Design a protein around this ligand. Structure first.
Ligand SMILES: Nc1nc2c([nH]c(=O)n2[C@H]2C[C@H](O)[C@@H](COP(=O)(O)OP(=O)(O)OP(=O)(O)O)O2)c(=O)[nH]1
Ligand code: NA
Ligand code: NA
Length: 129
């Protein structure tokens, strides 16, 4: 099975809300809630990837973020490594720049069942911040 490196951004505002998008019906992990992000490309670092992905997907430039969690997940047909970046400062206002659903969700109200299963320990970790 193919093995991908994925960089995602946990976009947290000052009211402890997270900017969460929903994946398309024909995507892998279809219809799931997600942190915006995507594939790290050849020639780019994980730090560069999360910046580029958040610019493409939601129209913000992260600054002074940090690695919140790195983990491996074996899906039924693919293995990925997920780089979860905590993004607490950024330029711009996040929106559905690719036409995807996107909105602010209270951290305490997040339900891990709504996300890909790889996100479960990260969501649990965020809720103890
Ligand atoms: N973006 C994102 N992906 C996640 C999360 N949790 C999780 O297991 N994934 C998985 C789903 C996918 O298998 C993979 C992300 O791939 P993607 O479809 O977002 O990649 P991409 O946008 O770069 O794809 P492409 O259209 O550029 O080719 O990581 C998450 O919180 N955010
Ligand atoms: Na991508
Ligand atoms: Na993506």
């Amino acid at each position: 099975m193919k093995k991908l490196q994925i960089a995602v951004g946990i976009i947290r505002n000052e009211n402890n809300e997270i900017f969460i998008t929903r994946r398309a019906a024909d995507a892998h992990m279809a219809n799931k809630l997600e942190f915006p992000g995507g594939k790290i490309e050849m020639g780019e670092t994980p730090e560069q990837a999360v910046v580029r992905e958040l610019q493409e997907e939601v129209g913000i430039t992260p600054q002074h973020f940090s690695l919140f969690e790195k983990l491996e997940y074996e899906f039924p047909d693919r293995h990925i490594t997920l780089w979860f970046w905590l993004v607490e400062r950024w330029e711009g206002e996040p929106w559905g720049k690719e036409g995807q659903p996107g909105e602010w969700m209270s951290l305490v109200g997040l339900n891990a069942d709504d996300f890909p299963p790889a996100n479960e320990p990260v969501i649990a970790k965020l809720k103890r911040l």
